[PDB]
Amino acid sequence: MVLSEGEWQLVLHVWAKVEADVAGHGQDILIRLFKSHPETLEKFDRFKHLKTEAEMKASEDLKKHGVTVLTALGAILKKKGHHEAELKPLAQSHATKHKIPIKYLEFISEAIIHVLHSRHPGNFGADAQGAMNKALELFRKDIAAKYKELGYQG
Numbered sequence: 001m002v003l004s005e006g007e008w009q010l011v012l013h014v015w016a017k018v019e020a021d022v023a024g025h026g027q028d029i030l031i032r033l034f035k036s037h038p039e040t041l042e043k044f045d046r047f048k049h050l051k052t053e054a055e056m057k058a059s060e061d062l063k064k065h066g067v068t069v070l071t072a073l074g075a076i077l078k079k080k081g082h083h084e085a086e087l088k089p090l091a092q093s094h095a096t097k098h099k100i101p102i103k104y105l106e107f108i109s110e111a112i113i114h115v116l117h118s119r120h121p122g123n124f125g126a127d128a129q130g131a132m133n134k135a136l137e138l139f140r141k142d143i144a145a146k147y148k149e150l151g152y153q154g
């Protein structure tokens with residue numbers, strides 16, 4: 001798939017808002033993911049023990065990881081489709097070390113959309129959401145293809 005320049009502009013305009021508070025958005029997105037799909041929390045030996053949202057919010061480790069995740073995703077989005085170099089190491093660790101099925105990447109995509117919808121209604125109308133969805137679908141399609149090449153495609 002290929003996004004138009006207009007679609008990338010919608011994606012990067014809302015991402016610029018997210019970047020005003022990377023740590024806050026990161027906490028919201030990961031907590032939304034762990035609450036909506038508790039099975040995903042099982043993949044994190046570091047966070048598996050967290051029992052409630054209050055505990056998740058108070059974890060400094062979880063917040064730091066959210067910043068690491070959003071910074072990586074942000075670098076990918078900014079390449080506007082030419083993200084092959086960035087995807088390689090991410091695909092390798094998530095397929096071989098962490099063992100993260102494409103289904104889970106769908107769950108976090110849903111979490112990202114929910115959080116942007118709640119915090120940025122003015123910059124995340126229908127057209128903007130469609131563009132963000134398309135960007136994340138592209139991300140998932142390319143990651144899936146790399147998974148296959150790496151021998152996982154899980």
Ligand code: HEM
Nearest residue numbers: 040043044046068069072073090093094098100104105108
């Ligand atoms: C937009 C989606 C994602 C991005 C950009 C992303 C990014 C990252 C980054 C940059 C790290 C650091 C280095 C590495 O190990 O590769 C990481 C680690 C990890 N990721 Fe992701 N990830 C994504 C989705 C997921 C999902 C959906 C799961 C699980 C449900 C997952 C599980 C993990 C685990 C288990 C680790 C290591 C945690 C630790 O250091 O203890 N990732 N991810």
